[PDB]
Scaffold this active site. Structure first.
Site, short mmCIF file in Angstrom:
data_model
loop_
_atom_site.label_atom_id
_atom_site.label_comp_id
_atom_site.label_asym_id
_atom_site.label_seq_id
_atom_site.Cartn_x
_atom_site.Cartn_y
_atom_site.Cartn_z
N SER A 166 1.74 9.05 -0.41
CA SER A 166 0.37 9.51 -0.53
C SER A 166 0.19 10.82 0.23
O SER A 166 0.85 11.07 1.25
CB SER A 166 -0.59 8.45 0.01
OG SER A 166 -1.92 8.93 0.03
N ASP A 220 3.92 -9.88 -8.69
CA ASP A 220 4.20 -9.30 -7.38
C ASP A 220 5.14 -8.11 -7.54
O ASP A 220 6.35 -8.28 -7.71
CB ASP A 220 4.81 -10.37 -6.47
CG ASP A 220 5.12 -9.86 -5.07
OD1 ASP A 220 4.71 -8.73 -4.74
OD2 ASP A 220 5.77 -10.60 -4.31
#
Ligand code: U1H
Ligand code: U1H
Length: 330
Positions: free
Chosen positions: A199, A35
């Site tokens: 992004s 994780d």
């Protein structure tokens, strides 16, 4: 030194991935959920309330000759989906794919939420975010990656998750045969303890690429792709009959539909998520409504590039003094 381990989806929908981890002496092998969105290594154990264990493999510290109780230390964690667990802390030897760390903090669960009990295939989590998020009190503990960093050939690990297929987590080296083209690196902010990046935009199917900054985290521990409402609305608008369902809790679509791909930007590069990756199957057995793999982050407060996005790429987690994230097509 280096390490390499195969990671395997737990079910036919790629809801999560498990990776074998050796804990203790002699080795006790547990299948852990790697994780990058959390920073605790915690396991089902012989101390877990028996009614909250249902098929999991448990860690038994009393059978490990290298296990030492960390006097007075406790841990308590709550995940964004409402899951939680808590217990005490041991130190022990932990090995991943040949890579060994001594004195790793192994957090033993005394109590786990129901979502973990019902997931018989996950014996625990191995956190790979930054150590500032570790929940051990009163003395914060380091992650497996942080403890291994000095001995690694390169201070990196890579995630190569498969679509309905096994994949690989590598520590300390970049497998140049596992991707195509070049790796595009992008800046990481550690101010919240996550692998947080920006992004450069998105496109739906064959549509025009929209240049727009999307701040989010690279999280192998989250199944879906959670993006701003404007983006997610633009995606599902191209799927005939798709709608947001309050009773279901997100966007659903007729199972007979074909989904368009989703492209996200990494600097000047483009990562394409095939439409089939966004199909998460019927909302209930026998239903002709299917659950979508791209959902709104409006209720969460942060954008999450989960497994749906990460499995479309070869992902480099560069833990150098200035950390960066690398994305390559594969
Ligand atoms: N995979 C761990 C995790 C869980 C929740 C969140 C959230 F929702 F708080 F962003 C981030 C990371
Ligand atoms: N994002 C961390 C995480 C991972 C798995 C689970 C589940 F599915 F096992 F409950 C919950 C939270």
């Amino acid at each position: 030194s280096t390490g390499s381990a195969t990671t395997t989806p737990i079910d036919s929908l790629d809801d999560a991935y498990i990776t074998p981890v050796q804990i203790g002496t002699p080795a006790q092998t547990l299948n852990l959920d790697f994780d990058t969105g959390s920073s605790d290594l915690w396991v089902f154990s012989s101390e877990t309330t028996a009614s909250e264990v249902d098929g999991q493999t448990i860690y038994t510290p009393s059978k490990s000759t290298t296990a030492k109780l960390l006097s007075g230390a406790t841990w308590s964690i709550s995940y964004g989906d409402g899951s939680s667990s808590s217990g005490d802390v041991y130190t022990d030897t932990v090995s991943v794919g040949g890579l060994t760390v001594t004195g790793q903090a192994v957090e033993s669960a005394k109590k786990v939420s129901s979502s973990f009990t019902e997931d018989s295939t996950i014996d625990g989590l191995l956190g790979l975010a930054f150590s500032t998020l570790n929940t051990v009190s009163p003395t914060q503990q380091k992650t497996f990656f942080d403890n291994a960093k000095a001995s690694l050939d390169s201070p990196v690990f890579t995630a190569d998750l498969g679509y309905h297929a096994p994949g690989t987590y590598n520590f300390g080296f970049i497998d140049t045969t596992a991707y195509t083209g070049s790796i595009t690196y992008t800046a990481v902010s550690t101010k919240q303890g996550f692998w947080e990046w920006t992004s450069t935009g998105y496109a739906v199917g064959s549509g025009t690429f929209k240049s727009t900054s999307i701040d989010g985290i690279a999280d192998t521990g989250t199944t879906l792709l959670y993006l701003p409402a404007t983006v997610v609305s633009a995606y599902w608008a191209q799927v005939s009959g798709a709608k947001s369902s309050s009773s279901v809790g997100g966007y659903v679509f007729p199972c007979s539909a074909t989904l368009p791909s989703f492209t996200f930007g990494v600097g000047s590069a483009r990562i394409v998520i095939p439409g089939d990756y966004i199909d998460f199957g019927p909302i209930s057995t026998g239903s002709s409504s299917c659950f979508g793999g791209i959902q709104s982050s409006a209720g969460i407060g942060i954008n999450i590039f989960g497994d749906v996005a990460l499995k479309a790429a070869f992902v480099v987690f560069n833990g150098a003094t200035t950390p960066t994230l690398g994305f390559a097509s594969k």
